Amino acid sequence: VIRSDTQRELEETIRPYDMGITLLDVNFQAARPPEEVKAAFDDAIAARENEQ
Amino acid sequence: VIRSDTQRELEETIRPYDMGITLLDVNFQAARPPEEVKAAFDDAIAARENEQ
Amino acid sequence: PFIETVKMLDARIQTMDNQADRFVTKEKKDLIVDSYIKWRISDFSRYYLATGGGDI
């Protein structure tokens, strides 16, 4: 739903401008969490394994 | 079955390509468990002898 | 000679490999996936135009 909204919103942002740039595709690449908190994210999974 | 499936899937995977490579044989070599758990896997067998 | 120039666009299937990358699942489980993609030039004119200079 974001790639749809951000693509639609970006187009609306450049409508008044009237520039001749045409949007072809909006392809989301990555959403990784901050590296500082990545450590805890993996530990939560390891805890499940430790529980078992 | 793993060699059979991998051989059949590999052929289906390269059918569209049209390459001139022909698969002759798929001979499975080994499926040994991870070295980290291999230690216990060996102990499990040694335990049988210890039990007896 | 010297007036016409020819651009050679390959019609053989191209193989594109993707390096290791991280993906987020529905349960926030980080995964490591190694994958490759295979494509072929369908419209040599358009591909050359879109990919200006016919660069793979």
C42 contacts in chain B (CB < 8 Å): none
Facing residues of C24 across strands?
Answer: C30
Whether residue C4 contacts residue C49, with contact meaning beta carbons closer than 8 Å, is answered with no
The structure tokens listed for C47 are 């591909």
Q: Within its chain, how far is the Cα of C10 from the centroid?
A: 13
Cα–Cα–Cα angle for A17, A19, A22, rounded to 5 degrees: 120
Backbone dihedral region of B25: left (phi > 0), alpha (psi from -120 to 50 degrees) or beta?
A: beta
Chains A and C make contact, 3+ CB pairs within 8 Å: yes
Under 8 Å between Cβ of C48 and C7? yes
Calculate the alpha carbon distances from C56 to C10, C20, C44 in Å.
10, 21, 12
Method for this entry: cryo-EM
Q: Which of A27, A30, A40, B15 is nearest to C23 (CA)?
A: A30
CB C42 within 8 A of CB C19: no
What 8-state DSSP symbol labels residue A39? Answer: H
Q: Which helix (H) or strand (E) holds A10?
A: helix A2-13
Q: Are B31 and B44 in contact (CB under 8 A)?
A: no
What secondary structure does DSSP assign to C10-53, as a single string? --SPEEEEEEEEEEE-TT--EEEEEEEEEE--S-HHHHHHHTTT
* B21 near C CB under 8 A: no
- Contact (CB<8Å) C30/A30: no
Which 30-49 residues of chain A touch chain C by CB within 8 A?
Answer: 30-32, 41-42, 45
